[PDB]
Amino acid sequence: LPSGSDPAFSQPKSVLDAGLTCQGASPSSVSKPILLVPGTGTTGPQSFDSNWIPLSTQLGYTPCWISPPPFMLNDTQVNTEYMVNAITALYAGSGNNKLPVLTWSQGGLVAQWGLTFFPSIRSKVDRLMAFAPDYKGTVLAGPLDALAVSAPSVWQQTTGSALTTALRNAGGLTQIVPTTNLYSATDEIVQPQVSNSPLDSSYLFNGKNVQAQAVCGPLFVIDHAGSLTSQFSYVVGRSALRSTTGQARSADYGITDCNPLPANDLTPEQKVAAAALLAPAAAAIVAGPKQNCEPDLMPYARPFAVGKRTCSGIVTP
């Protein structure tokens, strides 16, 4: 694990702060914040309005969220700066108290990239609840990279990207704070995920790796959005957020919780929005930025991906 000074932010603190919002509070004075880190092609709200914003509310958290522009499609390394700045702020804002981070898709990668590369936020996160995180990225990004039609962040979440190589090589496929990883075999966005083994994209060492089909059976299907919004995911999220250990406890759930439909503590209208969670992100992807190469790694990550090709060319330091 890196253990020096944090890297420099490439964004002005004012830009970063502007992407941080808290329900009914300013970050500088908030009780029991949880930070929500969105998936690819969405804003904080577009990810969590239909799910973890009300769910965290009812569990007695002040939901706060970052919305890195545009729709999490730019450089995961800059989307991470928004998350690091938010953790710094919300820790100080809550009386210097550790906060939980909850995340969907790339939000997980961003989180684990933060804890890998910016040591000062490890003493500020009491736990990480990653919903369908892509730590190895995914192989299903391959066709779109072959077309050279891919957002910066979609290059970086390709399996074998410089970014995913850099993370692994810096010791980033091991948990750095107590970490639960809810995910699904049937994820149509993130693969590989079928092994219920360290082969899976969502798997960390020492982490509470919950593959849905490992608890509910091989006849169980929740998809990429399902892994965030489902009653099953509520129960696992509830479990991790209340655990004295920082991790979901198998003691807290069972076979009768194997419900892939949106969380029952959402309103009927919330359920309907959560059901359709992914369409926004699919659309914002087809609407969004497009380049022919993977964004350069910033100097702090370059030593961990030597040999790989980014926009400037082959990585050397």
Catalytic pick among 50, 67, 224, 239: 224
Report the helix count and the strand count for the chain, using DSSP H and E. 13, 9
Query: What CA–CA distance (Å, rounded) separates 212 from 218?
Result: 9
Q: For residue 160, give both structure tokens.
A: 């074998």
Q: For residue 134, give both structure tokens.
A: 């892509």
Query: What CA–CA distance (Å, rounded) separates 69 from 78?
Result: 9
Q: For residue 1, give both structure tokens.
A: 């694990």
Burial of 127 (0-12, 13-18, 19+ CB in 10 A): buried
Is 138 in contact with 163 (CB distance < 8 Å)? Answer: no
Query: What CA–CA distance (Å, rounded) separates 157 from 134?
Result: 7
List helix spans (H) across 217-277.
226-229, 231-242, 268-275
Catalytic pick among 49, 75, 134, 187: 187
DSSP for 129-198, written as a single string: EEES--TT-BSTTHHHHHHT-B-HHHHHTBTT-HHHHHHHHTTTTB-SS-EEEEE-TT-SSS-S-SSSST
Q: What is the resolution of this structure in A?
A: 2.0
Q: Which of 46, 156, 58, 64 is nearest to 101 (CA)?
A: 64
Chain breaks in the chain (C to N over 2.5 A) after: none
Does 187 qualify as catalytic in the annotation?
Answer: yes
* Residue position matching structure tokens 């309907």: 272
Catalytic pick among 47, 105, 202, 230: 105
Burial of 219 (0-12, 13-18, 19+ CB in 10 A): exposed
Does 126 qualify as catalytic in the annotation?
Answer: no
Helix axes 162-169, 106-117, angle to 10 degrees: 50
The CATH code of the domain that includes 52 is 3.40.50.1820
Does 105 qualify as catalytic in the annotation?
Answer: yes
Query: What CA–CA distance (Å, rounded) separates 267 from 58?
Result: 12
Number of domains into which the chain is organized: 1
Which residue segment(s) compose the domain that 44 sits in?
1-317
